C-alpha cells in the first residue's frame, strides 16, 4: 500500500491581540528570527499596570503602618491606669484582614504586569508578524506573532476506510521526496485515529534520524503492507 | 437499500471559556484514554484562590465579631444594654451566614478552574492555541469520544420512509470487510426533516460483536 | 379550480437556546424522540447562586422584621419620660428597608424558577445538544428543539395571479407522491397580503390547516393540491 | 418610454428583540391582525422595572421625610434659648439635592417601565411574528414583529441612465397590472433620485384614487414620454 | 480609451449609535435639501437632560458650600481656626472646579442627542427601522450627498498607467448625451493598487458647465 | 538559473482603525495622496474629557501638596506642649494621596497624547475615510491607510522544488511587460521555511528587495524574474 502525507512541524505558538490587555507598544521580533524558549515577543503598554502595582504596594505599606499605630494605641490603652483595648482589638482584626486583601491584590497586579509582555514557549522560527491589528470584535482572530519549531518534525496525512486495516501504531516506515529522488528518510508511526468518497482518518509519524534537507510542507510518499 | 455511517454515541467538546480567566495547561494529548471524572484542562487558579482565601478570612471575621459581641454581652449582663447587643448578635449571625455562602461560591468558582471528563473514551482533538479575545467562532481545546456503544446514523427519503419500523433488528455490511455482517436494533426515525426531497435521519443501536468495526465506515444494508 | 404546491410543516414549535445570563448548565433531562407536554421542564441550569440569593433575601426580611420590632419596643420606652421623633424617623427608614428586602426576595424567587425552562406546547423533541460554549462564541446555540406532530399544516407561496383567484376559507384536497392511493383534505387559513422580500412575479406565502384524519402523513412531505372553486 | 415597477407599502414598523430590556414575556399579536396606531405588540418581563420604580418612589418619599425632620430640627435649634442652625441648613441643601436626584431617577424608572411594552406607530397588518429568538449577539438582527400599512400605497422602481432624461417630479401617470388587464390606476410621481449595464436610479410614485384590488408586490407597467 | 463614473465628492453617513441611548425622531425624509449645521436625527434627550440638571445642582451645591465656609470664616476670624477653614475653602474651590467640568461634559453629552449635517446637499437614504441590539453590521439612518463639486472616478490598468499625468485637462462624453463634452482636470492617480492585473484608481475634478450631468453616468474619454 | 513570478509590493505600511475606547473623532487632517513622515499626526480625537482629566489631576496634586503642608505646620504646633503621632500617621496617608495624584496625573498625560495617532514611517497616504460607526457594528473600520512608496520589494511563492535551488542572498534580474525596454535588479532577502497554510505541491513565500535605480516602477506590477546561479 502506497501513502502520501506532508511533513509538518510538531510545536507551534500563536500570539493573538488581546484587547483586555490594553494597547500594543511594539512587537520586538522579525519574521525569520530564531527565538529562545523564554525570549520576549510582544510588549503591551505597561504604564497602567506599573501604576496599579505601585498603588498596591502603597496600600500594603499603609496597612502595615495602620496596624502599627493600632498596636501602640492598644499597648497604651492596656497598661493604662485603671478607647477600649477590645474596641480596638476589633479594629486590629479588621486591619490585618485589609492587609491580607492588599497583599493578594499586590500579587495580582504583579502578574497583571508580567502579562503585559508575552514570552515564547519554545525555540523555533517566527514566521509571521502583524503590527496592524485593531481593538474591535473584528469577527476574526488577529494573529500577531506565529512561531513554529523546525525540529521534531513529523509527517501527517490521512487514510481511507480500506486503508486503516493496514497495520498500526509503533511501526517503523521509510519515505521518499520528489525533490530529492536519491535519499530516503525513516520514521516510526506515532498515531492513527479512529475518528474522521470515503471517510478519512489522520495519521502522524515522528521522524527518525537526521532531517537533512527536508523542509516543512514537503510532499512525501511511502510503501507499507496491508492485510 | 440505504446507506449510513457508524458513529460514536457519547462525546465531550470543551471550548475555551474566557470568563474562567485564562488557560494554564491542557493535560492530555491525542490518542490517550481518559476515564470518568479525569483532569482535562486547568485554568489558572490564582485570582480564584485569592477569592477563596478572602472569603475564608470573611467567615473568620464574622466569628471574631460574634465572639467580641457575646463576650460584650457577658460583661454588660452582670454589670448599650442586652437589647441592642443581642439584636446586633442577630445581625452578626446573618453576616456569618452570608460569609459561609460566598465562601462556598468561592469554592465552586475555584475548582471550576479545572474541567473534568464526563466519559470514558479516547481523546480525538487537542488545540492549545486559542485566542482569549473573541474569535467569532467556537474554539475547541479538547474532544473526547467513546469508541463503545457505537451506532449507525443516516437518512431516509420521503418515499423509503414508507418502510416504518419502531425497531426492526436489521444488519449491515460495508465493502471494507465484505464477508461480515453486523446486527443492530433500530432506535429512532425522525418525523421532522432537516433544514429534491425532505430527508429524515435515522439511528440504530448496534448490537454485539463489533470487532474491527470503527466509526468512519460507510455502511449499507437494504430491506 | 386552482392547483398549488406546498410542504407539510408543523404549526407549533419551540427552540431553547443557551443563555449565559442564566449561569451554567447542569442537565437537559430530555432525550431526542420524547413526547413533552405544555409545562414540562426541558433544561435545568445550576440553581446554586439563585438558592443562596433566596436565602440571603429571606434573612434580609428576617433582620428587617427584627429591626422594626426592636424600634417598636424602643419607641414605647421613650414614650414614658433617643426621642420618639428620632424613633419615628428610624421606623420610616426600616419600613423602606423591609420593602427593599421583599423586592429582593421576589427577585430571588423569579430568578429561581427561571433556572428551569418549560415547554410551551404539547410536542415531540426533535433535537438535543449538550455541547455549547459560554463566550457568545458565534451564532445562536440551539440546545433543545421540540415541535408538535399534531395540528399539522402545509405551506407555500402564490403567484400574483393566484391572489385574485383565492380567498381564505376555500376547501382544499391534496395528495402525496409517496402514498398515491391516499388522499387528504384541508382549508385555506392564511393568505399574505405582503410579498416575501427569466420569468417574473412576486410570491405571497399561504398556509392551510389539514382537516379530517391525518394518516401516516409526516412533516416535510411534498404535496400537490387542488383548491375547490365556489358555486 | 415604458417602465415597470412594483407596488410597495409606504409605512412599516419592525420590532427587534432587545437584550438590554431583559426577557420577553409574550408577543400578544398574530400574523394577520390589523392593529391600532397605539396597540401593544410585545411585552417584556416588567417585574424588575416595577420593583426599581417602587424603590425609586420610596427613595423620593424618604427624601421628603428626611427634609421634614431636618425642618423641625432647624426651627427648634433656631428659636432656641440663646446642632447649629447653619450646620443643618447645609444638610437641608444636601437633602433637597438628594430629593431632586431621587425624583429624576423615579421618572427614569417610570419610562424604564413604559419601555417594557412595545406599541405600534401605525395601524396596518402584522405580517410576521417570531417568538423563538435568543439573547446572544447572534450575528444578525432578530425580527419579532413586522407591521406594514396596506394604505397609502406607492409603486417603486428604477430607471437607466438614458431613462432619467424623461421628465420628472410632480408628473401624473397611469399604470396597468398583468392580473387585471381591464383596469388602469393613476399616480402622481413623488420622487426621482440622482444617486444610484448602466447605473439605475430609484423612483417612487404615490398612488391616486382607489386601490381597488391592487395588492402589494404587484408588478406594474406604464407609458410616459422622454425627450 | 478608459471609462469612469461621475461621483459626488462630499457625503455624510449617520449610523445608529447605541451608546447615545435610543432614537427619538429622524427629521428629514428623502429628496429634501439640507444645509450646513442642520438637525438630522434626534435621540431621546431625557437621561441626558437629567444628568445636566444634576451637574447644575452640583455646581450650585459647591457654591452653597463655599458660602457656608467663608461666612464661617467671617465668624471665627473676629471671635476650628482660620487655618483649617481656609484650607477646606481651598478644597471647596477644587470641588467647584470639578462641578463646572462635569457640568460642561453634561452639556456636550446633552446636545450630542441631536446630530447635525456637515454639508449642504440632498438626502439620499433614510432608514428609521433599526435594531438597538447589535446587528453585526452598520445601520445607516440618513445619507447626505452634495450634487455640487462633482468628480469622475475610475480605474487604470497596469499598462495604460504608462500614460501618467499630474493633471492633464481632459474631457469626456457618455452615450446618454452623445453630442456634448465635459471638461475636467485630473487630480489623483494612485500608486497603490486595490485589494488579470493590478488596477489603480484615478480621480478628476470636473470643471464647469455641469448642466444635465449627474452622478450615475458611465463616462468615456480616451487619449 | 531559476525563474519566478512575483508582484511589486511595498515594504512598510500602516493602518489606523477606529477606536471607540479613545472616544470621538474630530478631524482626520490628512487627504488621500499626501506625503507623511514618521511622527506626523494623522487623526485627532476630541481631547475634551482628557483635558478635564488632566486639570482635575493637577488640582489633585495641588490639594495634596496643600494637605502635606498644613499637616507639616500642624505637626510643629503639636511639638510644643491632636498629638504628633496622629499627625505622623496622617502624613503617611497624605504622601500616599500625593502618589495617587501623581499617577492619576501621568495617566491623564498619556491619555492626552493618545488622542493624536502618529505615523510610523515615511510614506504616502492611500486611503482616508471619515464615515465610521461607534457600535462595533461590524468588522474593522480602516480610517487611514498609508504606505511607503520607497524601499519597494517584490514577493511571491516558491515550489517545493525551488526551495532546494535557492539561497538567501542570490542576485536577481526582473522585467515588466509594460516597460519592456526597461529592466531592474534585486536581491533574495527572505525565503520561508514554513509553507502557506490537478497538480500538487505546497508553496513557500519569498520576498526580494529591489536594488539600484527604481524608475516609474509602481506597486502591484506583475513581474518576471531570473535568479542568477552561483559559480
Residue numbers in the entry:
A (entry chain A), D (entry chain A): 60 to 141, 164 to 277, 292 to 322
B (entry chain C), E (entry chain C): 61 to 139, 164 to 279, 292 to 319
C (entry chain B), F (entry chain B): 59 to 139, 164 to 279, 290 to 323
Task: Give the published text.
The operon spr0693-spr0694-spr0695 of S. pneumoniae R6 encodes a putative ABC transporter that contributes to the resistance of antibiotics and antimicrobial peptides. Sequence analyses suggest that the Spr0693–0694–0695 assembly is similar to Escherichia coli MacAB, with Spr0693 and Spr0694–0695 corresponding to MacA and MacB, respectively. Here we present the crystal structures of S. pneumoniae Spr0694–0695 and Spr0693, representing the structure of a MacAB-like efflux pump in Gram-positive bacteria. In summary, the structure of Spr0694-Spr0695 reveals some features for this family of ABC transporters, which are characterized by a unique 8-TM fold and an ECD/PLD insertion between TM1 and TM2.
As initial efforts to get the full-length structure of Spr0693 failed after exhaustive trials, we made a series of truncations and finally a truncated version (Ser59–Lys324) without the membrane-proximal (MP) domain, enabled us to solve the structure at 3.0 Å. The quaternary structure of Spr0693 displays a typical hexameric nanotube, similar to the previously reported MFP structures. The two outermost α-helices form a twisted left-handed α-helical hairpin domain; and six helical hairpins further pack into a cylindrical assembly to form an α-helical barrel of 31 Å in diameter and 56 Å in height. The 24-Å high lipoyl domain at the middle harbors two layers of three-stranded β-sheets packing against each other, with a topology similar to the biotinyl/lipoyl carrier proteins and domain family. The β-barrel domain at the bottom is composed of six twisted anti-parallel β-strands and a short α-helix, which form a stacked β-barrel of 24 Å in height. The six lipoyl domains, as well as the six β-barrel domains, are aligned in a head-to-tail manner to form a double-layered ring-like structure in the quaternary structure. A top view of the Spr0693 cylinder structure reveals a narrow pore, which is formed by the loops (residues Asn211–Val224) from the lipoyl domains. These loops adopt a so-called turn-back conformation and point towards the center, forming a hexameric ring with the residue Gly220 at the innermost site. However, the glycine residue Gly220, as well as the loop, has a relatively higher B-factor, and the primary sequence of the loop is variable in the homologs of Spr0693, suggesting that the ring is structurally flexible and might have a rather broad spectrum of substrate selectivity. Structural superposition reveals that the hexameric Spr0693 shares an overall architecture quite similar to that of MacA, with an RMSD of 2.85 Å over 1226 Cα atoms.
